[PDB]
Design a binder for this molecule. Structure first.
Ligand SMILES: *[C@@H]1O[C@H](CO)[C@@H](O)[C@H](O)[C@H]1NC(C)=O
Ligand SMILES: *[C@@H]1O[C@H](CO)[C@@H](O)[C@H](O)[C@H]1NC(C)=O
Ligand SMILES: *[C@@H]1O[C@H](CO)[C@@H](O)[C@H](O)[C@H]1NC(C)=O
Ligand SMILES: *[C@@H]1O[C@H](CO)[C@@H](O)[C@H](O)[C@H]1NC(C)=O
Ligand SMILES: *[C@@H]1O[C@H](CO)[C@@H](O)[C@H](O)[C@H]1NC(C)=O
Ligand SMILES: *[C@@H]1O[C@H](CO)[C@@H](O)[C@H](O)[C@H]1NC(C)=O
Ligand SMILES: *[C@@H]1O[C@H](CO)[C@@H](O)[C@H](O)[C@H]1NC(C)=O
Ligand SMILES: *[C@@H]1O[C@H](CO)[C@@H](O)[C@H](O)[C@H]1NC(C)=O
Ligand SMILES: *[C@@H]1O[C@H](CO)[C@@H](O)[C@H](O)[C@H]1NC(C)=O
Ligand SMILES: *[C@@H]1O[C@H](CO)[C@@H](O)[C@H](O)[C@H]1NC(C)=O
Lengths: 138, 138, 138, 138, 138
């Protein structure tokens, strides 16, 4: 007539996490867990992987049992070329340019005029602005 | 008639984490856990991996049992070429340029004019601004 | 009729962590745990990895049991070429340039004019500003 | 009828950590733990790794048991070339330049004018400013 | 009918750590623990690694048990070339330059003018400023 108390356990219990950031790449933030017996595991081999939050009871009576390589993980990869990549390209290859090429041969009595006005061409770009009861003036 | 008290345990219990940052790359922040028996594990091999928050009871009676290599991890990778990468490119390859190429051969009595006005061309770019009851004037 | 008191234990218990930072790369900050039996483990091999927050009871009676290499970790990698990398490129390759190339051959009585006005071209860039009841004037 | 008192233990218990910093690279800060039996462990091999916050009870009666290499870690890596790196590039390769190349051959009676005005071209860049009831004037 | 008092122990218990710093590289600061049986351990091999905050009870009766190399760590790495590095590049390769190249051959009666105005070109850069009820005037 024994007794085990109930378990109220948290692998991650953050209370009121107020966080301001920009980039979360390959990481964990704002009270987040990257995988329980998992996550970013490109090549894995797990024998008898068990997750049970409930109570566990075992009454085992093993007699003259021949266990030959139980839960064996024969991890023998050959020439494994696997790609599991995350690519994020934001505001990449942005060009604001004015280019002029001049190639004049034996030019006599000639006038060359190259005017490239560039005014108010881009006012805003990639403005990741979060507003809450706020004001922004540009 | 024994008794084990209940377990109220937290691997990470941050209370009210107020944090300001910019980049979280390959790390942990703001009360976050990178993996419980996991995370970023490209090549792994785990035999009998068990996670159970509940109470555990075991009553084992093993007699004359032949256990030959139980829970064996034969980790023998050969020529493993695996890629699990996180790429973040933000505001990369940004160019604001004015380029002029002049190639004049035996130019007689000629006038060359190259005017490239560049005014108010980019006012804002990559402005990651978080506003809460605030004001910004540009 | 024995008794074990309940366990209220925290691997990390930070209370009210107020933190200001910029970059968290490959590290831990703001009360964060990088992995419990895990994290950033590119090549790993764990036999019988067990995590249980609950109470543990074991009543083992092993008699004449032949355990040949139990929980054996045969970690024999050959030519393992694995990449699990985090890449963050923010405001990289930013160029604000005015370039002029002049190549004149036997130029007689000629006028060369190269004007590149550059005014108010970029007012703000990569402004990671967090505002709370604040004001910014540019 | 014995008794063990409950354990209330913290591997890291920082109370009200108020911290201001810039870079946390490959380190620990703001009351953070880098791994419990883990963290940044590129090549690892652990046999029977166990974490249990709850109470542990063991009643073992082993008789005539042949344990041949139990929990053996055969850590024999050959030619292991693994990369688990964190790369953070912020405001890298920033160039503000005015370049002029002049190549004149036998130039007679010629005027060369190279004007590159550069005014108010970049007002702010990489301004990582955290504001709380504050004012900034540029 | 014995009794063991409860353990309230902290590996690190900093109360109200108020800290101001700039760089935390490969270190520990602000009441942070770099790893419990872990941290930054690129090549490791641990047999039976156990962490349990709860109370431990062991009643072992071992008789005529043959333990051949129990918990053996055969740590024999060969040609291990592993890289787990943290790279942080902030405000690197910043160039503000005005360059002029002059190559004139047998130039007769010619005027060369090279004007590169550079005014208010960069007002702020890499300003990591934390403000709390404060004022900054530029
Ligand atoms: C455009 O961007 C891609 C990646 O998004 C890059 O690989 C390439 O070199 C760029 N091309 C240009 C700038 O012409
Ligand atoms: C061009 O050059 C020739 C030189 O032989 C001259 O006769 C002519 O007047 C020139 N053109 C002008 C518009 O002056
Ligand atoms: C453009 O960016 C890519 C990566 O995003 C870089 O590899 C490449 O060299 C860049 N090309 C340019 C600047 O022309
Ligand atoms: C160009 O040069 C020739 C020199 O022979 C001259 O006759 C002519 O007047 C010139 N052109 C002008 C517009 O002066
Ligand atoms: C552009 O950036 C990439 C990385 O983002 C770098 O490898 C390359 O050399 C750069 N190219 C330029 C500056 O032309
Ligand atoms: C150009 O040079 C020649 C020299 O022979 C001269 O005759 C001519 O007047 C020149 N051009 C001008 C516009 O002066
Ligand atoms: C651009 O930056 C990369 C790394 O981000 C560096 O390796 C390269 O040499 C740089 N290229 C330039 C400055 O042209
Ligand atoms: C150019 O030089 C020649 C010298 O022979 C001269 O005749 C001519 O007047 C010059 N050009 C000017 C505009 O003075
Ligand atoms: C640019 O920076 C990289 C590292 O970020 C450095 O290795 C390289 O020499 C630099 N290139 C330049 C200054 O051209
Ligand atoms: C250029 O030099 C020659 C010398 O022979 C001269 O005749 C000519 O007047 C010169 N040019 C000017 C504009 O003085």
């Amino acid at each position: 007539g024994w007794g085990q108390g109930g378990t109220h356990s948290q692998w991650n219990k953050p209370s009121k996490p107020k966080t301001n950031m920009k980039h979360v790449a390959g990481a964990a933030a704002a009270g987040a867990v990257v995988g329980g017996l998992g996550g970013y595991m490109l090549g894995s081999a797990m024998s008898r992987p068990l997750i049970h939050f409930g109570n566990d009871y075992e009454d085992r009576y093993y007699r003259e049992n021949m266990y030959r390589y139980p839960n064996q993980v024969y991890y023998r990869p050959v020439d494994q070329y696997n790609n599991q990549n995350t690519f994020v390209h934001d505001c990449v290859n942005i060009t604001v340019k004015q280019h002029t090429v001049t190639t004049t041969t034996k030019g006599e009595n000639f006038t060359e005029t190259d005017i490239k006005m560039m005014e108010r061409v881009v006012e805003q770009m990639c403005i990741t602005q979060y507003q809450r009861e706020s004001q922004a003036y540009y």
